[PDB]
């Protein structure tokens, strides 16, 4: 029974205990492998974090490293680079930024949560539900804005020609000209993809041109109905909330289950080398590093606490579930869920921006 | 004012080369791992107060440039990738970083590969790529250039291999090839398994022409036994470009950006205090983007690579040596038949 170490970089010591428990339960499930848990909390600065990945995690010969956030999100980057140096898989548990979907910079990175850009999957399904064929997409000119635009246009091109895109520089509080252009294009359904600070600026300028009321439908994601943006969001807006997106323990026990299942499916093969023992003197990659990454991404773990766990071609989580939230009288109301492939109605009625009220459709 | 130079073992160690006084620090090390890279730059930053780093490498690890980009955005130290894995272009430079490389983008390399085929009238070719990062940019630049040009090429549908280690799957995909010229895009570790599999199928003999970018050739001093004789590659690992000349270009870029920053601002940014234990107002970012040295354009793009890199077409002879057979670098044209 050889030991296989699993690394982790978690938020608190309380979560390290949960990480050790999940690996302990994974060992109960039963080649015989003894999984061992090795973890640290986040370091002060990124440099010390990278060094702690070498000295505390890679020095223990970890086959993978689970990464969440610190307490009070681009923090997994120092872990991604250092462990990606040897092609050691890095499973992100919290971050939803789209820069981690670029394998040219984060080749060895996976995620149990989907990036914000994959919210366009739900936008695409509501366009099929309501038979919407002309939408206006307003995105910020940044990595997250382009990724949301590209994912939406891909799903539409699988049938341009159905959406018009308007981009704005982040940090700009003067969206008057951009929004007047949206009006000139006969805008009815507007899809907004921006940060909390940027979405707030869009809403305030939208109320300027009387576009927060009747005659308009606002489809947004999670950041656009979070914090400051919610205070200025128009009544009747429809946003998304990733189910279990912020529950670190749920993704700790789900990632452990996927890694454990993938470790045993890996050792069924031949010519398997051990991960590097430390950083100093080791310059070549882990020989079976890329193979293990292909084994993880090909994994299918349907019995997951966060639903079915499959991974994108870029390592992003598939079959994630969202809550379709509709702002009614300054209060967010769940009018249905996207259960990974379809939309489920749930017995409430959507309140459109204004007075018109309707259900989560499925009918004329 | 204070610049450090880190290299690998070979002929080395003789130290030094406008208003600034340049104190060059020359150290050598055989270890190029994340901890060794961070420690050396931080130890170098903590003693000597360095304003810029010239780093050269002797490996195939593309992730060295990944670490130097990270170190440069955490210490605010301008770092120049000179040779080896430090100069391999993969990831875009971080916007806040000041890490630039003596390398060529994939679009610049495919420009050279198409000019080669146009000269030898190789209008028929196949495209063989893996799912390795960069392959979608590779296919796009080749499809658009072929469709936009008037050379009237014939291009087989792109053959894509999802997993290396494929065994039969690689063999099934390589059988779809029905062209004499083959453009292969994959990593150097992936090329070993693919070209060794293509040799068993009788596809690597002088009957065929395999053209690979610098990702496959990598370091010109490390040639795997699975690479076939007659392999054509476009790389920026010029053997004629000396390490002494490269570090001179590295020093020339930093000193020019230093005096230029000493003319617009009255001071040079002091080096950070320490890497451990606990931001600059102005950096040399805008001063080393465009810099000319000894009649050579050493400008960098915002993505990190050079605007006018020294591309070189190399061939692999039966003696298992790369032979410089062409040069693209002069006046935007490929001069072959060397």
């Amino acid at each position: 029974p050889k030991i296989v170490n699993i690394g982790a970089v978690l938020s608190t010591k309380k979560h390290e205990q949960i990480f050790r428990e999940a690996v302990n339960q994974a060992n109960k499930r039963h080649r015989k492998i003894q999984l061992q848990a090795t973890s640290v909390t986040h370091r002060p600065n990124a440099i010390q974090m990278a060094l702690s990945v070498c000295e505390d995690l890679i020095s223990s010969q970890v086959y993978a490293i689970l990464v969440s956030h610190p307490p009070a999100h681009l923090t997994p980057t120092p872990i991604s680079y250092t462990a990606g140096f040897y092609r050691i898989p890095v499973i992100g548990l919290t971050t939803r930024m789209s820069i981690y979907s670029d394998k040219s910079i984060h080749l060895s990175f996976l995620r149990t949560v989907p990036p914000y850009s994959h919210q366009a999957l739900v936008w695409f399904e509501m366009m099929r539900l309501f038979n919407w064929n002309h939408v206006i997409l307003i995105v910020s000119d940044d990595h997250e804005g382009r990724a949301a635009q590209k994912k939406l246009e891909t799903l539409l091109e699988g049938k341009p020609k159905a959406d018009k895109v308007l981009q704005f520089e982040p940090g700009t509080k003067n969206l008057t000209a951009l929004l007047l252009e949206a009006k000139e294009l006969e805008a009815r359904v507007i899809i907004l993809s921006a940060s909390e600070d940027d979405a707030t600026a869009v809403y305030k300028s939208a109320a300027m041109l009387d576009m927060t009321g009747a005659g308009y439908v606002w489809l947004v994601g999670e950041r656009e109905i979070s914090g400051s943006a919610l205070r200025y969001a128009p009544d009747g807006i429809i946003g998304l909330q990733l189910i279990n997106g912020k529950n670190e323990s749920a993704h700790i026990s789900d990632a452990v289950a996927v890694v454990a299942q993938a470790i045993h499916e890996l050792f069924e093969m031949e010519n398997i080398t051990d991960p590097p023992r430390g950083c100093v003197g080791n310059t070549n990659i882990w020989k079976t590093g890329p193979l293990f990454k292909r084994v993880l991404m090909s994994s299918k773990y349907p019995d997951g606490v966060t639903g079915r766990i499959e991974f994108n071609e870029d390592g992003d989580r598939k079959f994630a579930q969202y809550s379709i939230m509709n702002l009614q009288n300054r209060k967010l109301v769940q009018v249905g869920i996207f259960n990974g492939s379809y939309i489920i109605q749930n017995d409430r009625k959507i309140i459109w921006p204004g007075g018109e009220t309707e259900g989560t459709l499925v009918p004329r | 004012l204070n610049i450090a130079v880190l290299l690998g073992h070979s002929h080395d160690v003789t130290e030094r080369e406008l208003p600034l006084d340049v104190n060059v620090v020359a150290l050598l090390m055989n270890r190029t791992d994340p901890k060794s890279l961070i420690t050396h730059v931080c130890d170098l930053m903590s003693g000597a107060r360095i304003h810029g780093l010239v780093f050269g490498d002797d490996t195939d690890q593309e992730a060295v440039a990944q670490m130097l980009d990270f170190i440069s955005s955490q210490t605010f130290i301008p770092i120049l990738g000179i040779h080896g894995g430090a100069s391999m272009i993969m990831a875009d430079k971080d916007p806040t970083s000041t890490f630039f490389q003596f390398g060529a983008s994939i679009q610049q390399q495919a420009t050279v590969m198409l000019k080669i085929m146009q000269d030898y009238d190789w209008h028929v070719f196949s495209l063989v790529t893996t799912i390795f990062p960069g392959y979608r940019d590779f296919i796009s630049f080749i499809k658009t250039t072929v469709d936009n040009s008037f050379v009237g090429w014939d291009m087989q549908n792109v053959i894509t291999l999802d997993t290396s280690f494929e065994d039969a799957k690689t063999q099934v995909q390589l059988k779809k090839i029905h062209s004499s010229v083959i453009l292969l895009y994959c990593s150097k570790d992936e090329a070993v398994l693919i070209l060794s599999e293509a040799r068993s199928l009788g596809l690597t003999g002088y009957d065929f022409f395999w053209i690979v970018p610098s990702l496959v050739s990598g370091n010109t001093e490390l040639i795997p036994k699975e690479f076939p004789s007659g392999l054509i590659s476009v790389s920026y690992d010029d053997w004629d470009y000396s390490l002494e000349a490269r570090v001179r270009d590295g020093l020339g870029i930093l000193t020019t950006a230093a005096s230029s920053m000493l003319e617009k601002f009255s001071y040079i940014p002091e080096a950070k205090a320490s890497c451990y234990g606990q931001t600059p107002l102005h950096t040399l970012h805008q001063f080393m983007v465009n810099v000319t040295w000894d009649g050579k354009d050493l400008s960098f793009t915002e993505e990190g690579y050079q605007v006018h890199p020294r591309l070189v077409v190399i061939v692999l002879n039966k003696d298992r040596e790369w032979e410089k057979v062409g040069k693209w670098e002069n006046q935007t044209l490929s001069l072959r038949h060397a």
Partner: antibody
Amino acid sequence: EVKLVESGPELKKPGETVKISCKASGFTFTNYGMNWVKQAPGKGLKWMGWINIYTGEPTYADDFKGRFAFSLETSASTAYLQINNLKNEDTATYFCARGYDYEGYFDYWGQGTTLTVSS
Amino acid sequence: DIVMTQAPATLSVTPGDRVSLSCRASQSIADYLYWYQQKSHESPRLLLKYPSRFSGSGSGSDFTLTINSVEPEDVGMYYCQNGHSFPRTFGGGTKLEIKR
């Protein structure tokens, strides 16, 4: 590689002050904590306290408050243990142990410093 | 505070047998329970996080360190440390002797 070398043995009369050094090597200082453990001759292991190395914040135990001060250099990678008003009950071997994470287990110990408070 | 009480002070094991040393805590400390080995005239050495012949089991308030195949080099003192709350306390120690 990773080592902890403490200062040599000391001999002090009752009522003086001594400073024990703990020089660390082979790892990133300010990434761990330093624990100080006391062991009387053949009389078990007793915990004195620890000090965060990133933030020089000491944490003394109840039995070792008042006459014990934790200190460090961070440039020489050295942790210090100073004991004032020496009594006869202080004659013991004093180990420094690195705290994994901070507040984790003690994964690396020094060789120990033998202190003798006799007249 | 919290006192760590180790069940057998001394043990004499035949080379190759399997010995289990116990460590009971007054209060529950979850899994923050470490094991140290101190050979004669040496500093303590960390054994178990929460070798290759040493294994750890137990949780809550009662734990156990087991040596599957005892080796002659295993002679010495074995302490268990509470690392769950301040102040951290050690056990009374277990002296391991080997039959011969």
